[PDB]
Amino acid sequence: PQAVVVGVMAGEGVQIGVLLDANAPVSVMTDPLLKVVNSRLRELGEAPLEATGRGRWALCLVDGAPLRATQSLTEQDVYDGDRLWIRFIADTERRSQVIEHISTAVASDLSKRFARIDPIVAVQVGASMVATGVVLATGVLGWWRWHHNTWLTTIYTAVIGVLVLAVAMLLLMRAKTDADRRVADIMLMSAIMPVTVAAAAAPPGPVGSPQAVLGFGVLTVAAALALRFTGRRLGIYTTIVIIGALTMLAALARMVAATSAVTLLSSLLLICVVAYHAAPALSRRLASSVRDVLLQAERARSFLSGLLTGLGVMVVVCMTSLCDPHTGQRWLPLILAGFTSGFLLLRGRSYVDRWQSITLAGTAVIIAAAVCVRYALELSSPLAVSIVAAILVLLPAAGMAAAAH
Amino acid sequence: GSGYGLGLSTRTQVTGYQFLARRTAMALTRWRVRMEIEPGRRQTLAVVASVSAALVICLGALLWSFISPSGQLN
Amino acid sequence: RKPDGKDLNFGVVRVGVGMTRPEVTWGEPQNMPTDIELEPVTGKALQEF
């Protein structure tokens, strides 16, 4: 315990392993330490460290935060095998500017700390507004199809889909930089929705199972096509493909022949339940040499996050539909939902990622809350709402206390 | 003294204050004070014209009521 | 540091930070109007400056 070995980072990126005294104060070691790293750099033939104007030499964490000069290395939470960084930190002292006339002062000050609008952001705003407009257009066009069996809905939506897709192609080819690519992506992704309903609206007669088969099918293809040719925005496209694929299976079965929805919903629930265990394997396999490895790594991490999200959406829709408050042994699906939620609530710790762990934990909470709220709406009475309120308010309070304590 | 409390003031002082208010109001919105054109005043006078035109129509409606009296169910 | 007359820093020591007179030299406004003749806005502006 008298000494600890740590890796020290020096100028421009050389790492050196050193055995430091665990109890002397850090300020006593920084000077001779600087000499040693320079000697090794001199022997290697690299440029040694040198001072520039006004500043001082410091020892910092890899995060850059400096260590207290008077405390002992053991007094700080530094353990054998850790790593540190020696650095030159410049002087910040300077004159203090002043402006006595208030009106001028407000302008000269306010213009430094905040950002004003510019042409680069402006295009993203306009692009964002047109994306919103078309998804609104499909909604009203879709509502008309629910009362009339005429060809108008498919006829109108098809031309929009073509025009929107047309503009995106030009931008994709003319794009030069990431900002430019953002604009193209937003435009391209916005075309899938009109094209999708344009197809699903084509089959005549009252809307239902036969139309559903077309919609989710072309949707799956469209998302897969964009993902294949673009190779960007992996997370969202992955999700659309998953939910589209599973929904098409249900649509086809229900369209051909199905004894009950409970049977289909139960099948989907089981498929989703097992998919959670397979997700990490699927994600890992779906994915100067360092560039390829880093690119591979983020692509994989991206796939798992999207994969988890697609599964989370399906279970809450099925689960809340299965636990009917009037059908048969009403208590059976309620406790089954509990067991299913407990599994997800516990499983969240198996993943290191912040957002991945949060979505899983939230998936359980949202199911419980959604299920609880339904029992307030249906089979309504003062007891029901009163109980739903007490449960929902205590529920998270217990979880927060259990996590903070 | 320190100018505290209510009192009396000249016309020269009143426009002076009314000018500093406009200049400072511009700074918070445009972040500049050259005021090559002063849109603040122009935009306000348009409101006055809008209100004034509305009152003129009220006076117009009032005179018609004296030229040819009538009444409405109530 | 050198003592040979031209080095103005010889014998000078730093003790802290504070206020000081700038190297600029301000010229008084000519033909100043009487106090009863002063405009209110520009008067305070120049006074604070």
Short mmCIF file of C-alpha atoms in Angstrom, two decimals:
data_model
loop_
_atom_site.label_atom_id
_atom_site.label_comp_id
_atom_site.label_asym_id
_atom_site.label_seq_id
_atom_site.Cartn_x
_atom_site.Cartn_y
_atom_site.Cartn_z
CA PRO A 1 0.00 0.00 0.00
CA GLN A 2 3.06 2.26 0.07
CA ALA A 3 2.94 2.81 -3.71
CA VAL A 4 0.51 2.47 -6.64
CA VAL A 5 1.18 1.88 -10.35
CA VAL A 6 -0.68 4.10 -12.83
CA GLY A 7 -0.45 5.08 -16.49
CA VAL A 8 0.42 8.76 -17.14
CA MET A 9 -0.48 10.48 -20.42
CA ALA A 10 1.89 13.15 -21.72
CA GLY A 11 2.14 15.51 -24.68
CA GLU A 12 0.16 14.74 -27.84
CA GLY A 13 -0.56 11.13 -26.72
CA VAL A 14 2.31 8.98 -25.33
CA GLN A 15 1.29 6.71 -22.41
CA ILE A 16 3.90 5.79 -19.75
CA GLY A 17 3.55 3.34 -16.84
CA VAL A 18 4.90 4.66 -13.50
CA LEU A 19 4.93 3.58 -9.83
CA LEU A 20 3.93 6.54 -7.64
CA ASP A 21 4.31 7.14 -3.90
CA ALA A 22 0.86 6.61 -2.38
CA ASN A 23 1.16 9.08 0.56
CA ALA A 24 3.29 12.08 -0.46
CA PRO A 25 1.19 15.08 -1.52
CA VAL A 26 0.64 15.29 -5.27
CA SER A 27 2.21 18.75 -5.50
CA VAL A 28 5.57 17.27 -4.46
CA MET A 29 5.68 14.77 -7.38
CA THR A 30 4.57 16.84 -10.41
CA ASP A 31 7.97 18.53 -10.92
CA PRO A 32 10.27 15.46 -11.02
CA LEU A 33 7.53 13.57 -12.89
CA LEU A 34 7.69 16.16 -15.69
CA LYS A 35 11.47 15.66 -15.97
CA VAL A 36 11.10 11.86 -16.35
CA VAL A 37 8.51 11.99 -19.15
CA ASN A 38 10.63 14.55 -21.03
CA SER A 39 13.72 12.35 -20.76
CA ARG A 40 11.84 9.42 -22.29
CA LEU A 41 10.50 11.70 -25.04
CA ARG A 42 14.02 12.98 -25.68
CA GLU A 43 15.31 9.42 -25.97
CA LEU A 44 12.44 8.52 -28.31
CA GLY A 45 13.33 11.57 -30.44
CA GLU A 46 9.97 13.30 -29.95
CA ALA A 47 9.39 16.94 -29.02
CA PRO A 48 9.70 17.51 -25.24
CA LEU A 49 7.16 19.49 -23.23
CA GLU A 50 7.76 23.24 -22.82
CA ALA A 51 5.99 26.21 -21.21
CA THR A 52 4.33 29.02 -23.19
CA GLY A 53 3.88 32.50 -21.75
CA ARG A 54 1.79 32.42 -18.57
CA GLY A 55 0.48 29.22 -17.00
CA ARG A 56 1.35 26.29 -14.75
CA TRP A 57 1.94 22.52 -14.76
CA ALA A 58 -0.82 20.27 -13.40
CA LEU A 59 -1.78 16.60 -12.97
CA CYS A 60 -5.34 15.75 -14.03
CA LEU A 61 -7.73 12.87 -14.53
CA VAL A 62 -8.29 11.70 -18.07
CA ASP A 63 -11.47 13.74 -17.85
CA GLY A 64 -9.29 16.82 -17.36
CA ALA A 65 -10.38 17.61 -13.78
CA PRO A 66 -7.34 18.53 -11.64
CA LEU A 67 -6.36 16.83 -8.38
CA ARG A 68 -6.06 18.77 -5.08
CA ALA A 69 -2.41 19.78 -4.66
CA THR A 70 -2.34 19.29 -0.85
CA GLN A 71 -4.06 15.92 -0.55
CA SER A 72 -2.21 12.61 -0.60
CA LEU A 73 -2.64 10.28 -3.55
CA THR A 74 -4.22 7.75 -1.16
CA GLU A 75 -6.41 10.47 0.28
CA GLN A 76 -8.00 10.66 -3.17
CA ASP A 77 -9.95 7.74 -4.68
CA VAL A 78 -7.06 6.66 -6.91
CA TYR A 79 -6.35 2.92 -7.14
CA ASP A 80 -3.48 0.86 -8.53
CA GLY A 81 -3.87 0.37 -12.28
CA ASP A 82 -5.69 3.65 -12.96
CA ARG A 83 -4.41 6.34 -15.37
CA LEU A 84 -3.69 10.08 -15.16
CA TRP A 85 -2.73 13.08 -17.35
CA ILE A 86 0.03 15.70 -16.86
CA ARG A 87 -0.81 19.02 -18.46
CA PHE A 88 0.06 22.68 -18.92
CA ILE A 89 -2.83 25.00 -17.97
CA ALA A 90 -2.75 28.65 -19.14
CA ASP A 91 -3.42 31.81 -17.13
CA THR A 92 -6.98 33.28 -17.23
CA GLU A 93 -6.29 36.69 -15.58
CA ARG A 94 -7.20 39.76 -17.69
CA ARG A 95 -8.67 43.26 -17.51
CA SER A 96 -12.39 43.68 -16.79
CA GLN A 97 -14.35 45.47 -19.52
CA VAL A 98 -17.10 48.01 -18.63
CA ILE A 99 -19.84 50.01 -20.38
CA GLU A 100 -21.71 52.68 -18.36
CA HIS A 101 -24.49 53.51 -20.82
CA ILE A 102 -27.11 50.82 -20.27
CA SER A 103 -28.70 50.69 -23.73
CA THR A 104 -25.40 49.96 -25.49
CA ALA A 105 -24.32 47.56 -22.74
CA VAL A 106 -27.36 45.33 -23.20
CA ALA A 107 -26.62 44.85 -26.90
CA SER A 108 -22.86 44.27 -26.60
CA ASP A 109 -23.49 41.74 -23.82
CA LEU A 110 -26.54 39.87 -25.12
CA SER A 111 -24.95 39.26 -28.51
CA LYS A 112 -22.14 37.13 -27.05
CA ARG A 113 -23.98 34.50 -24.95
CA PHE A 114 -26.80 33.58 -27.38
CA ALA A 115 -27.04 32.30 -30.97
CA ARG A 116 -29.04 34.08 -33.69
CA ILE A 117 -30.82 32.41 -36.61
CA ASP A 118 -28.91 31.59 -39.81
CA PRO A 119 -29.56 30.09 -43.30
CA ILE A 120 -28.31 26.63 -42.30
CA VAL A 121 -30.91 26.13 -39.59
CA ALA A 122 -33.59 27.86 -41.67
CA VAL A 123 -33.67 25.05 -44.24
CA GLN A 124 -34.12 22.44 -41.53
CA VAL A 125 -37.10 24.42 -40.23
CA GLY A 126 -38.77 24.61 -43.63
CA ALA A 127 -37.91 20.98 -44.24
CA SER A 128 -39.43 20.09 -40.89
CA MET A 129 -42.65 21.99 -41.67
CA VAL A 130 -43.20 20.22 -45.02
CA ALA A 131 -42.64 16.85 -43.35
CA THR A 132 -45.36 17.71 -40.82
CA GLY A 133 -47.72 18.97 -43.51
CA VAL A 134 -47.73 15.72 -45.52
CA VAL A 135 -48.27 13.47 -42.51
CA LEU A 136 -51.28 15.70 -41.78
CA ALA A 137 -52.42 15.41 -45.40
CA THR A 138 -52.44 11.60 -45.26
CA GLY A 139 -54.54 11.69 -42.09
CA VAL A 140 -57.49 13.57 -43.59
CA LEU A 141 -57.20 11.59 -46.85
CA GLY A 142 -57.29 8.40 -44.75
CA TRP A 143 -60.33 9.45 -42.74
CA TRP A 144 -62.34 9.86 -45.95
CA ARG A 145 -61.58 6.23 -46.98
CA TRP A 146 -63.29 5.03 -43.76
CA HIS A 147 -66.69 6.20 -45.03
CA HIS A 148 -66.32 6.00 -48.82
CA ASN A 149 -65.12 3.16 -51.06
CA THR A 150 -64.03 5.43 -53.98
CA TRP A 151 -60.55 5.48 -55.58
CA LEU A 152 -59.85 9.14 -54.60
CA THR A 153 -57.70 8.32 -51.54
CA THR A 154 -55.24 6.13 -53.44
CA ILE A 155 -55.31 8.40 -56.52
CA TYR A 156 -54.47 11.54 -54.52
CA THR A 157 -51.95 10.03 -52.10
CA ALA A 158 -49.97 8.32 -54.88
CA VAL A 159 -49.10 11.57 -56.69
CA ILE A 160 -47.92 13.14 -53.42
CA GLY A 161 -45.73 10.14 -52.64
CA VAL A 162 -44.08 10.34 -56.05
CA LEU A 163 -43.46 14.09 -55.83
CA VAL A 164 -41.97 13.88 -52.33
CA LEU A 165 -39.77 10.95 -53.30
CA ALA A 166 -38.71 12.82 -56.43
CA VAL A 167 -37.38 15.88 -54.56
CA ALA A 168 -35.44 13.70 -52.09
CA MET A 169 -33.50 11.98 -54.89
CA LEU A 170 -32.07 15.29 -56.13
CA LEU A 171 -31.03 16.43 -52.65
CA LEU A 172 -29.41 13.08 -51.90
CA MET A 173 -27.24 13.39 -55.01
CA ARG A 174 -26.43 17.09 -54.54
CA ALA A 175 -25.69 16.77 -50.80
CA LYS A 176 -22.11 17.51 -49.71
CA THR A 177 -22.01 17.67 -45.87
CA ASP A 178 -23.73 16.25 -42.78
CA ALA A 179 -25.95 19.29 -42.53
CA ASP A 180 -26.95 18.72 -46.11
CA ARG A 181 -27.54 15.05 -45.41
CA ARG A 182 -29.85 15.87 -42.49
CA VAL A 183 -32.12 17.79 -44.89
CA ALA A 184 -32.16 14.91 -47.35
CA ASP A 185 -32.89 12.29 -44.69
CA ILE A 186 -35.84 14.23 -43.28
CA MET A 187 -37.25 14.61 -46.76
CA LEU A 188 -36.69 10.95 -47.69
CA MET A 189 -38.15 9.45 -44.51
CA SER A 190 -41.32 11.57 -44.95
CA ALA A 191 -42.22 9.76 -48.23
CA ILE A 192 -42.81 6.31 -46.67
CA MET A 193 -46.11 7.31 -45.00
CA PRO A 194 -48.00 8.53 -48.11
CA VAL A 195 -46.71 5.67 -50.28
CA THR A 196 -47.81 3.17 -47.60
CA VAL A 197 -51.42 4.33 -47.18
CA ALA A 198 -51.67 4.93 -50.92
CA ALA A 199 -51.27 1.17 -51.42
CA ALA A 200 -53.36 0.00 -48.44
CA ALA A 201 -56.25 2.25 -49.56
CA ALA A 202 -56.52 0.62 -53.01
CA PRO A 203 -58.61 -2.50 -52.15
CA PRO A 204 -62.33 -1.68 -52.55
CA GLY A 205 -65.12 -2.33 -50.08
CA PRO A 206 -65.19 -1.63 -46.36
CA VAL A 207 -61.70 -1.28 -44.85
CA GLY A 208 -60.25 -4.11 -42.77
CA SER A 209 -58.03 -7.19 -42.72
CA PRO A 210 -57.49 -7.32 -46.52
CA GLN A 211 -56.27 -3.71 -46.65
CA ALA A 212 -54.07 -4.18 -43.55
CA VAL A 213 -52.06 -6.91 -45.34
CA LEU A 214 -51.01 -4.50 -48.09
CA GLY A 215 -50.09 -1.58 -45.80
CA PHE A 216 -47.75 -3.29 -43.33
CA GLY A 217 -46.23 -5.31 -46.18
CA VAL A 218 -45.20 -2.39 -48.40
CA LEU A 219 -44.21 -0.53 -45.22
CA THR A 220 -41.73 -3.28 -44.31
CA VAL A 221 -40.31 -3.29 -47.85
CA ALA A 222 -40.03 0.49 -47.99
CA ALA A 223 -38.15 0.69 -44.69
CA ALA A 224 -35.89 -2.19 -45.74
CA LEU A 225 -35.23 -0.53 -49.11
CA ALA A 226 -34.26 2.82 -47.56
CA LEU A 227 -32.02 1.12 -44.98
CA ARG A 228 -30.29 -0.93 -47.67
CA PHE A 229 -29.54 1.95 -50.06
CA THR A 230 -28.91 4.68 -47.44
CA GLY A 231 -27.07 2.91 -44.60
CA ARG A 232 -27.88 5.80 -42.23
CA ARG A 233 -30.47 6.40 -39.46
CA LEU A 234 -30.30 2.71 -38.47
CA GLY A 235 -32.23 2.92 -35.18
CA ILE A 236 -35.55 4.22 -36.50
CA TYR A 237 -35.68 2.16 -39.71
CA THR A 238 -34.92 -1.03 -37.73
CA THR A 239 -37.99 -0.34 -35.56
CA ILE A 240 -40.36 0.22 -38.52
CA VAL A 241 -39.27 -3.07 -40.10
CA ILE A 242 -39.83 -5.05 -36.87
CA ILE A 243 -43.31 -3.66 -36.12
CA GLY A 244 -44.26 -3.92 -39.81
CA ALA A 245 -43.15 -7.56 -40.11
CA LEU A 246 -44.92 -8.84 -36.98
CA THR A 247 -48.08 -6.87 -37.84
CA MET A 248 -48.23 -8.32 -41.38
CA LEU A 249 -48.17 -11.87 -39.95
CA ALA A 250 -51.14 -11.04 -37.71
CA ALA A 251 -52.92 -9.29 -40.59
CA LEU A 252 -52.44 -12.25 -42.97
CA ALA A 253 -53.66 -14.78 -40.38
CA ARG A 254 -56.67 -12.66 -39.42
CA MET A 255 -57.36 -12.10 -43.13
CA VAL A 256 -57.23 -15.81 -44.03
CA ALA A 257 -58.79 -17.43 -40.94
CA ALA A 258 -58.64 -16.87 -37.18
CA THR A 259 -60.78 -18.29 -34.39
CA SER A 260 -60.08 -15.37 -32.05
CA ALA A 261 -57.90 -12.30 -31.54
CA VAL A 262 -56.79 -13.62 -28.13
CA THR A 263 -55.06 -16.50 -29.93
CA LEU A 264 -53.15 -14.18 -32.27
CA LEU A 265 -52.31 -11.69 -29.50
CA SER A 266 -51.09 -14.52 -27.25
CA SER A 267 -48.86 -15.86 -30.05
CA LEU A 268 -47.34 -12.42 -30.65
CA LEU A 269 -46.72 -11.93 -26.91
CA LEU A 270 -44.78 -15.21 -26.74
CA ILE A 271 -42.77 -14.29 -29.85
CA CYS A 272 -41.87 -10.92 -28.27
CA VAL A 273 -41.08 -12.53 -24.89
CA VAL A 274 -38.49 -14.85 -26.46
CA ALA A 275 -37.13 -12.14 -28.79
CA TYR A 276 -35.73 -10.15 -25.84
CA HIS A 277 -33.25 -12.94 -25.10
CA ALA A 278 -32.21 -13.20 -28.78
CA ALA A 279 -31.87 -9.42 -29.36
CA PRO A 280 -28.20 -9.08 -28.29
CA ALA A 281 -27.13 -11.98 -30.48
CA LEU A 282 -29.14 -10.68 -33.43
CA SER A 283 -27.70 -7.18 -33.01
CA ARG A 284 -24.08 -8.31 -32.76
CA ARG A 285 -24.32 -10.50 -35.88
CA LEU A 286 -26.33 -7.98 -37.91
CA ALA A 287 -23.31 -5.66 -38.04
CA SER A 288 -5.91 2.66 -40.24
CA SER A 289 -7.93 -0.49 -39.56
CA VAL A 290 -9.32 1.14 -36.38
CA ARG A 291 -11.86 3.11 -38.46
CA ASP A 292 -13.65 -0.10 -39.49
CA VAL A 293 -13.77 -1.36 -35.87
CA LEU A 294 -15.18 1.90 -34.43
CA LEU A 295 -17.74 2.12 -37.26
CA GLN A 296 -18.70 -1.50 -36.63
CA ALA A 297 -19.05 -0.87 -32.89
CA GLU A 298 -21.48 2.05 -33.13
CA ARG A 299 -23.54 0.34 -35.83
CA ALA A 300 -24.06 -2.67 -33.52
CA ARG A 301 -24.94 -0.54 -30.48
CA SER A 302 -27.39 1.28 -32.74
CA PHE A 303 -29.10 -1.92 -33.88
CA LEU A 304 -29.71 -3.24 -30.35
CA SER A 305 -31.30 0.03 -29.19
CA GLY A 306 -33.71 0.06 -32.13
CA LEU A 307 -34.33 -3.67 -31.78
CA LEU A 308 -35.31 -3.28 -28.11
CA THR A 309 -37.60 -0.37 -29.01
CA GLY A 310 -39.51 -2.36 -31.65
CA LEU A 311 -40.24 -5.15 -29.16
CA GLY A 312 -41.31 -2.73 -26.41
CA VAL A 313 -44.01 -1.20 -28.65
CA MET A 314 -45.62 -4.55 -29.54
CA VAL A 315 -45.91 -5.97 -25.98
CA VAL A 316 -47.73 -2.97 -24.47
CA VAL A 317 -50.28 -3.00 -27.31
CA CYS A 318 -50.91 -6.76 -26.92
CA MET A 319 -50.74 -6.90 -23.09
CA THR A 320 -53.24 -4.07 -22.51
CA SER A 321 -55.59 -5.70 -25.04
CA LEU A 322 -55.38 -9.13 -23.37
CA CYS A 323 -56.10 -8.08 -19.75
CA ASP A 324 -59.81 -7.36 -20.33
CA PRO A 325 -61.62 -6.33 -17.09
CA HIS A 326 -64.80 -8.35 -17.93
CA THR A 327 -63.70 -11.46 -19.87
CA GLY A 328 -63.55 -14.64 -17.77
CA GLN A 329 -60.93 -15.08 -15.05
CA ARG A 330 -60.15 -11.36 -14.93
CA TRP A 331 -57.43 -11.94 -12.27
CA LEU A 332 -55.42 -14.39 -14.42
CA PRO A 333 -54.15 -11.92 -17.09
CA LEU A 334 -53.63 -9.19 -14.44
CA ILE A 335 -51.11 -11.29 -12.45
CA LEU A 336 -49.58 -12.65 -15.70
CA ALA A 337 -48.98 -9.03 -16.73
CA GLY A 338 -47.31 -8.58 -13.33
CA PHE A 339 -44.97 -11.56 -13.87
CA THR A 340 -44.18 -10.32 -17.39
CA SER A 341 -43.49 -6.80 -16.06
CA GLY A 342 -41.29 -8.12 -13.23
CA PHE A 343 -39.09 -9.95 -15.76
CA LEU A 344 -38.50 -6.77 -17.81
CA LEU A 345 -37.99 -4.68 -14.65
CA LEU A 346 -35.24 -7.05 -13.46
CA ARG A 347 -33.69 -7.67 -16.93
CA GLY A 348 -32.90 -3.94 -17.43
CA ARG A 349 -29.65 -4.28 -15.42
CA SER A 350 -28.19 -6.75 -17.97
CA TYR A 351 -27.46 -3.87 -20.40
CA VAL A 352 -24.76 -1.21 -19.82
CA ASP A 353 -26.25 1.49 -22.08
CA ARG A 354 -28.05 4.40 -20.43
CA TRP A 355 -30.87 4.72 -22.97
CA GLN A 356 -31.24 0.93 -23.38
CA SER A 357 -31.64 0.41 -19.63
CA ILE A 358 -34.07 3.33 -19.35
CA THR A 359 -36.35 2.09 -22.16
CA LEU A 360 -36.57 -1.39 -20.61
CA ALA A 361 -37.33 -0.06 -17.13
CA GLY A 362 -39.88 2.30 -18.62
CA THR A 363 -41.48 -0.48 -20.68
CA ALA A 364 -42.50 -2.20 -17.44
CA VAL A 365 -43.75 1.01 -15.81
CA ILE A 366 -45.81 2.02 -18.85
CA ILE A 367 -47.49 -1.41 -19.00
CA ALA A 368 -48.50 -1.30 -15.33
CA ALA A 369 -49.79 2.28 -15.62
CA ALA A 370 -51.62 1.66 -18.89
CA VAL A 371 -53.22 -1.50 -17.48
CA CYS A 372 -54.13 0.32 -14.25
CA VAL A 373 -55.75 3.25 -16.10
CA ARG A 374 -57.96 0.93 -18.20
CA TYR A 375 -59.59 -0.40 -14.99
CA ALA A 376 -60.60 3.18 -14.14
CA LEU A 377 -62.29 3.73 -17.52
CA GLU A 378 -64.11 0.38 -17.79
CA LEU A 379 -66.05 -1.11 -14.86
CA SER A 380 -66.03 2.46 -13.53
CA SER A 381 -67.06 3.35 -9.98
CA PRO A 382 -65.75 5.58 -7.15
CA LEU A 383 -63.84 2.64 -5.65
CA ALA A 384 -62.11 1.86 -8.96
CA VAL A 385 -60.84 5.40 -9.66
CA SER A 386 -59.90 5.94 -6.00
CA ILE A 387 -57.86 2.72 -5.97
CA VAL A 388 -56.27 3.41 -9.37
CA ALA A 389 -55.17 6.82 -8.12
CA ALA A 390 -53.63 5.48 -4.88
CA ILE A 391 -51.80 2.68 -6.69
CA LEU A 392 -50.41 4.93 -9.43
CA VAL A 393 -49.18 7.61 -6.99
CA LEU A 394 -47.52 5.14 -4.59
CA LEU A 395 -46.07 2.87 -7.33
CA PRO A 396 -43.27 5.20 -8.50
CA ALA A 397 -42.72 6.59 -4.99
CA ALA A 398 -41.70 3.12 -3.80
CA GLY A 399 -39.39 2.62 -6.81
CA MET A 400 -37.62 5.97 -6.36
CA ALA A 401 -37.04 5.31 -2.66
CA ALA A 402 -35.77 1.78 -3.38
CA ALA A 403 -33.31 3.17 -5.98
CA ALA A 404 -32.11 6.22 -4.04
CA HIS A 405 -31.65 4.35 -0.75
CA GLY B 1 -31.48 65.11 -3.16
CA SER B 2 -32.08 61.94 -5.19
CA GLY B 3 -35.16 62.71 -7.27
CA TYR B 4 -37.39 60.62 -5.08
CA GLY B 5 -41.19 60.92 -5.10
CA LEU B 6 -43.72 62.55 -7.37
CA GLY B 7 -43.15 66.04 -8.73
CA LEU B 8 -43.01 68.26 -11.82
CA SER B 9 -41.07 68.01 -15.08
CA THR B 10 -40.51 69.85 -18.36
CA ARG B 11 -41.47 68.84 -21.91
CA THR B 12 -37.76 68.54 -22.78
CA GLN B 13 -37.34 65.93 -20.09
CA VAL B 14 -40.43 63.99 -21.22
CA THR B 15 -39.31 63.44 -24.81
CA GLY B 16 -35.82 62.62 -23.58
CA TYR B 17 -37.11 59.73 -21.51
CA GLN B 18 -39.47 58.63 -24.29
CA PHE B 19 -36.43 58.42 -26.58
CA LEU B 20 -34.25 56.34 -24.24
CA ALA B 21 -37.10 53.87 -23.84
CA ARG B 22 -37.36 53.27 -27.60
CA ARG B 23 -33.58 52.92 -28.01
CA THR B 24 -33.36 50.36 -25.22
CA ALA B 25 -36.40 48.46 -26.43
CA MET B 26 -34.73 48.04 -29.81
CA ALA B 27 -31.57 46.60 -28.23
CA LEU B 28 -33.41 43.71 -26.59
CA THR B 29 -35.02 42.73 -29.90
CA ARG B 30 -32.47 43.49 -32.67
CA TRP B 31 -29.22 43.59 -30.66
CA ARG B 32 -28.13 46.74 -32.52
CA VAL B 33 -28.70 50.49 -32.09
CA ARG B 34 -27.79 52.25 -35.37
CA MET B 35 -31.58 52.75 -35.91
CA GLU B 36 -31.22 53.68 -39.56
CA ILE B 37 -35.03 53.39 -39.69
CA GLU B 38 -37.12 53.31 -36.53
CA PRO B 39 -39.71 50.55 -37.07
CA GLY B 40 -40.89 50.76 -33.49
CA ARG B 41 -42.73 54.03 -34.00
CA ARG B 42 -44.04 53.09 -37.47
CA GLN B 43 -45.61 49.89 -36.10
CA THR B 44 -47.29 51.76 -33.23
CA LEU B 45 -48.83 54.51 -35.38
CA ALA B 46 -50.47 51.81 -37.54
CA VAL B 47 -52.35 50.64 -34.43
CA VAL B 48 -53.48 54.20 -33.72
CA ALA B 49 -54.72 54.45 -37.30
CA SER B 50 -56.61 51.17 -36.88
CA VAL B 51 -58.33 52.37 -33.69
CA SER B 52 -58.98 55.81 -35.16
CA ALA B 53 -60.61 54.33 -38.26
CA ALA B 54 -62.84 52.18 -36.05
CA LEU B 55 -64.01 55.24 -34.08
CA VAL B 56 -64.70 57.16 -37.31
CA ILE B 57 -67.02 54.37 -38.37
CA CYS B 58 -68.69 54.56 -34.94
CA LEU B 59 -69.32 58.29 -35.49
CA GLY B 60 -70.66 57.41 -38.97
CA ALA B 61 -73.07 54.84 -37.49
CA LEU B 62 -74.14 57.35 -34.83
CA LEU B 63 -75.15 60.01 -37.40
CA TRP B 64 -77.19 57.54 -39.51
CA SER B 65 -79.15 56.73 -36.33
CA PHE B 66 -80.27 60.36 -36.03
CA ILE B 67 -81.06 60.81 -39.73
CA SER B 68 -83.47 57.83 -39.87
CA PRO B 69 -84.57 56.48 -36.46
CA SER B 70 -85.64 52.82 -36.19
CA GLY B 71 -85.68 49.97 -33.68
CA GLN B 72 -84.92 46.30 -33.17
CA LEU B 73 -86.65 43.53 -31.24
CA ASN B 74 -85.24 43.00 -27.78
CA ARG C 1 16.40 42.97 -15.41
CA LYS C 2 19.21 45.50 -16.02
CA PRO C 3 20.13 48.71 -14.11
CA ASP C 4 21.45 50.59 -17.18
CA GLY C 5 19.03 53.55 -17.20
CA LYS C 6 16.83 52.44 -20.11
CA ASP C 7 15.11 49.52 -18.27
CA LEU C 8 12.19 51.29 -16.56
CA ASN C 9 11.27 48.08 -14.66
CA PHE C 10 14.42 48.08 -12.49
CA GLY C 11 13.51 48.36 -8.82
CA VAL C 12 9.77 47.75 -9.52
CA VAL C 13 7.72 45.06 -7.69
CA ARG C 14 4.16 43.68 -8.10
CA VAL C 15 1.94 43.73 -4.99
CA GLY C 16 -1.57 42.91 -6.29
CA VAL C 17 -4.36 44.11 -8.57
CA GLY C 18 -6.43 47.26 -8.63
CA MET C 19 -7.51 50.46 -10.38
CA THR C 20 -5.27 52.72 -12.47
CA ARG C 21 -5.29 55.77 -14.74
CA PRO C 22 -5.21 54.92 -18.47
CA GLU C 23 -2.47 56.22 -20.77
CA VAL C 24 -5.07 58.25 -22.73
CA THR C 25 -5.48 62.01 -22.23
CA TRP C 26 -9.03 63.45 -22.42
CA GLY C 27 -9.66 66.96 -23.77
CA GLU C 28 -12.29 69.15 -22.13
CA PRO C 29 -15.34 69.99 -24.31
CA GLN C 30 -14.95 73.54 -25.61
CA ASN C 31 -17.66 76.21 -25.21
CA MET C 32 -19.62 74.29 -22.52
CA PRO C 33 -23.29 75.47 -22.23
CA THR C 34 -24.40 76.78 -18.84
CA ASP C 35 -26.15 74.36 -16.49
CA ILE C 36 -29.47 76.06 -17.20
CA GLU C 37 -28.64 75.61 -20.90
CA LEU C 38 -27.77 71.86 -20.76
CA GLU C 39 -29.81 69.19 -22.60
CA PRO C 40 -30.85 66.35 -20.23
CA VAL C 41 -30.02 63.19 -22.25
CA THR C 42 -26.55 64.08 -23.54
CA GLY C 43 -25.69 65.76 -20.27
CA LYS C 44 -25.94 62.62 -18.17
CA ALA C 45 -24.37 60.56 -20.95
CA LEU C 46 -21.22 62.69 -20.97
CA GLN C 47 -21.22 62.92 -17.16
CA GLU C 48 -21.26 59.12 -16.69
CA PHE C 49 -18.68 58.65 -19.46
#
